[PDB]
């Protein structure tokens, strides 16, 4: 049955965040997209917590917590979905949430409605959103003294995402919707994804 095949492939590709260890780090395969995530930049972030004074809310703040590079990738995927989002966006939003607020490799479709939504079209729309987003990110300039764009922000009721281009990769942060971390020393989660990962 055509619907059956279609939904079989969409379910498989959207509900399984596939991670495979490699020599340099990790291969991630999700939604038919492939990423090489390496462990570079990892140690540097621990060590920091000039740049240190630029992002005091991350480095000079006992409420900031460094995450894994895979977490950073997942934040980038969710952001990619949400950025155009701002049809059934219910399913999209669920997916983005799963990606960003959890570390599980499988997406439990709770409702049957959600399951019904999983289709070639949904796969297609998600892939296109994420690719568009990645292209946008690649247009960011490194942090600079002229007025050239270096950050994008994706704000939602539940959380605020901020992604910044620096000489060491994309700095990926999630703060509370209000931006309590920016006083004040509100909580914030963050990491670094090397440039190579998005190419």
Author numbering: 13 to 61, 71 to 107, 114 to 209, 212 to 228
Sentences from the study reporting this entry:
VP24, one of only eight proteins encoded by ebolaviruses, functions in virus replication and assembly, and is thought to contribute to immune suppression by binding to a certain class of molecules called karyopherins to prevent them from transporting a transcription factor termed STAT1. In addition to its role in interferon antagonism, ebolavirus VP24 has also been proposed to associate with membranes, and is important for assembly and function of the viral ribonucleoprotein complex (RNP), where VP24 binds to the viral nucleoprotein NP. VP24 adopts a compact, single domain, α/β structure of novel fold (DaliLite v.3). The overall shape of VP24 resembles a triangular pyramid of dimensions 73 Å×30 Å×30 Å.
In order to provide 3D templates for understanding VP24 and its many roles in immune evasion, replication and assembly, we crystallized VP24 from Sudan virus (two versions crystallized: SUDV1–233 and SUDV11–233) and Reston virus (one version crystallized: RESTV11–237). We determined the structure of SUDV11–233 at 2.1 Å resolution by multiwavelength anomalous diffraction (MAD) using selenomethionine-incorporated protein expressed recombinantly in E. coli. Crystal structures presented here include VP24 from an ebolavirus that is pathogenic to humans (Sudan virus; SUDV) and VP24 from an ebolavirus that thus far, appears nonpathogenic to humans (Reston virus; RESTV), although it is lethal to nonhuman primates. The overall folds of SUDV and RESTV VP24 are similar, as expected (r.m.s.d. of 0.81 Å; also see Figure S2b for structural alignment). The entrance to the hydrophobic cavity (11 Å wide) appears to be gated by two residues (Y172 and M71) that point away from each other in RESTV VP24 but toward each other in SUDV VP24, appearing to block the hydrophobic cavity. Crystal packing can sometimes illustrate biologically relevant assemblies, but no tetrameric or other higher oligomeric interactions are observed in crystals of SUDV or RESTV VP24. One pairwise VP24-VP24 interaction is conserved in the crystal packing between the SUDV (P3121) and RESTV VP24 (P1211) structures, although it is currently unclear if it is biologically relevant. This interaction involves α1, β1–3 and the N-terminal region of α8, and buries residue L147 that was previously implicated for virulence, although 142–146 remain solvent exposed. Another crystal lattice interaction observed in both RESTV and SUDV structures involves packing of the hydrophobic N-terminal regions of VP24 into the Face 3 pocket of a neighboring molecule.
